[PDB]
Amino acid sequence: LSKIKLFYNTPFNNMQNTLHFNSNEERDAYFNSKFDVHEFTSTFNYRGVLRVTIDLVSDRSCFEQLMGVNYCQVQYIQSNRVEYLFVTDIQQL
């Protein structure tokens, strides 16, 4: 029920230093246009703090090693509301 971007090597990792845009969809315009190597689609639970499973079928030396990700966008559809989250840890399975 929701499409997800997974931003790489982001500056936003102090839970207290942020960036600020004159208006929402001007920041969605910002974020929706910078990526390095990954976006997908799934859905996820809630209660912070929460988890989202994800996978990588194309590998040779990847497996986990999506690595540098630390921030992500989610937009729920249909709802089309956007919400950003820090990714705190990537435990592998």
Add this chain to the structure above:
Amino acid sequence: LSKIKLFYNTPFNNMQNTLHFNSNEERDAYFNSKFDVHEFTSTFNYRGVLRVTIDLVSDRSCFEQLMGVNYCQVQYIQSNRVEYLFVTDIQQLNDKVCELSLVPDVVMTYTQGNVLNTLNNVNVIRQHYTQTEYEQNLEQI
């Protein structure tokens, strides 16, 4: 899925004093060439903190008593990426298969070479000064 060295009587055991090399594979060159009595191959889990089982089939007065190990290298293959960890404790299981707990030496793994100098807009607290910068923060000190 990974080859492992198990370094003996290492200096690296403060989780906060490290050694520094001009570049990564110059330290892998370093580490890959000093050993005293053990290297092997297995694979291991993760979540720090994590464990890796290991064994010693050749014994008479060994069993656990690999003893002085406190630091280790892992390189995943195929991936060929390297990562170093402190070995925190060696709890034993039976008269030859002892189990190792580990915690990543992030300071050795990632910081190597001329990286941290590239960092901008970081609030520093204490460092050591170049001669130029010394003369500047001198009246201060």
Add this chain to the structure above:
Amino acid sequence: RISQDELNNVKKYYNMFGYECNDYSTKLSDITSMSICNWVQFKGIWTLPNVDTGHMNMLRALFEAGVRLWHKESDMINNTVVNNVII
């Protein structure tokens, strides 16, 4: 002047832990300024290119509490820090 011994305790202290800079928002001084070891201690915000966000949370905070970067292994087990110096 203070005792020769005490003069070394100070020499050591500085050579060991660097000096106090209250520089918010600044590029790190060189990491190899010194001859024996470099101290390096800094608060956010930074990321290193392509590092497991978990491991970053460690680096970011391991450095908030300082880290001594030795340059030679021999210096780590000899009383050499007294002769730390720039270039």
Add this chain to the structure above:
Amino acid sequence: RISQDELNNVKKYYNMFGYECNDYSTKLSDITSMSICNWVQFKGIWTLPNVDTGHMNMLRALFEAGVRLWHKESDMINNTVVNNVII
């Protein structure tokens, strides 16, 4: 006057964390006063229109401990804060 470096340490400190106001019951000063970043730290009581009450409890308390609102991403990884300024 104080050392040029020390003058910047102060310049930075202010430019980074704003100034101390003991204004209970007051409208926030503008959020884009500055050129590089705005500091903003405030105790209750407020709600933002149509926000999950849970998420509010976070905002309300995240701001009690202050939040730096940067204006350009470039400014977040360059030593530019020393030149923060009004208009």
Add this chain to the structure above:
Amino acid sequence: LGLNPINDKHLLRPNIVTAELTDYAGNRLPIDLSLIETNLEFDSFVTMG
């Protein structure tokens, strides 16, 4: 002062080294070595006759 002049300039601070002038008649002058930029030069201001 037995200070290495090449990299110990940061040690010219009052709790490591101290300088005082006296005429051995109670006239004194304390000196805070953290304030001489590079040289402890004494000049004078004498009026006579």
